[PDB]
């Protein structure tokens, strides 16, 4: 894969020189990318889960697992054990493949896109960006789609600090908002 081969050859040595680690093992890499579809309308609409799973299937290229509520909440009329969310864990090749498509195509196609925020790190070098519409993904056809659902995309890295993670994502090609 383009991005995967790029990281092993070019990015990894570059980051070793940047922060001057003692071992190559110390270079931050991306471990996994989890995409989460909070299906809160599963309480009201029964087939809400089926919509999110069909998008993730095409978007992630990997069968999602349906996540369920841990406890009941009165405000949302939610009972424990109800399917109210979809989740997919990308590792290894499939992670890079998706990240390549995401960066090269999806984020550009965002309506009035102005770069991803610099503040959206967890504090320990993990990035999470919120997609609002599924049209940006070229796999999703406009005609078949009924409802405009978004999603969360968490990039989990081995970077201890946000600085080191930000440097990693920048060289991978993350369009940061200047």
């Amino acid at each position: 894969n383009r991005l995967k081969e790029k990281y092993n050859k070019e990015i990894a040595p570059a980051l070793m020189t940047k922060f001057n680690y003692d071992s190559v093992m110390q270079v931050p890499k991306i471990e996994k990318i989890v995409i989460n579809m909070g299906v809160g309308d599963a309480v009201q609409n029964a087939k809400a889960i089926d919509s999110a799973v069909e998008e993730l299937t095409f978007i992630a290229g990997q069968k999602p697992v349906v996540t369920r509520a841990k406890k009941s909440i009165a405000g949302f009329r939610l009972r424990e054990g109800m399917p109210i969310g979809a989740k997919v864990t990308l590792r290894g090749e499939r992670m890079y493949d998706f990240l390549d498509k995401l960066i090269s195509v999806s984020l550009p196609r965002v309506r009035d896109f102005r770069g991803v925020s610099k503040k959206s790190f967890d504090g320990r070098g993990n990035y999470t960006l919120g997609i609002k519409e599924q049209l940006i993904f070229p796999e999703i056809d406009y005609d078949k789609v009924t409802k405009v659902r978004g999603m969360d995309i968490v990039i989990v890295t081995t970077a201890n600090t946000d600085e080191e993670a930000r440097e990693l994502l920048t060289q991978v090609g993350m369009p940061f908002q200047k």
Binding site: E31, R124, G125, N126, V156, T157, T158, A159, N160
Partner: protein
């Protein structure tokens, strides 16, 4: 950031669970297996005294094979330790799978120990 728990720490939990119901005795000792990245080891230990009766691994001079971290090597190891046990008058043993899934190499080592004539 993501701290990875050591596989060994997780393995020890499974092994402790096994050892709750299973322990080596003088008459019927415990054949414990350890499976590293490169080698595999078997000890026969009596737990009342904390003494290893017999042992065999892929580090012994008897074994001549290069890929020592595979099922073929494991079969030879189980066979060798089982032979030594019969020499030391050990017939019945309890298999301590050491927290590993009883499959692949550990299962192969177990099969070798039965053919050599350990009753378990």
């Amino acid at each position: 950031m993501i701290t990875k728990t050591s596989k060994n720490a997780a393995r020890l939990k499974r092994h402790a669970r096994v050892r709750a119901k299973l322990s080596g005795t003088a008459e019927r000792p415990r054949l414990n297996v350890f499976r590293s990245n490169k080698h595999i080891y078997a000890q026969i230990i009596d737990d009342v005294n904390g003494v290893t009766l017999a042992s065999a691994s892929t580090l012994d001079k008897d074994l001549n094979v290069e890929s020592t971290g595979d099922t073929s090597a494991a079969t030879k190891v189980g066979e060798l330790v089982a032979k030594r046990a019969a020499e030391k008058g050990i017939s019945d043993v309890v298999f301590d799978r050491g927290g590993y899934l009883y499959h692949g190499r550990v299962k192969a080592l177990a099969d070798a120990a039965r053919e050599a004539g350990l009753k378990f």
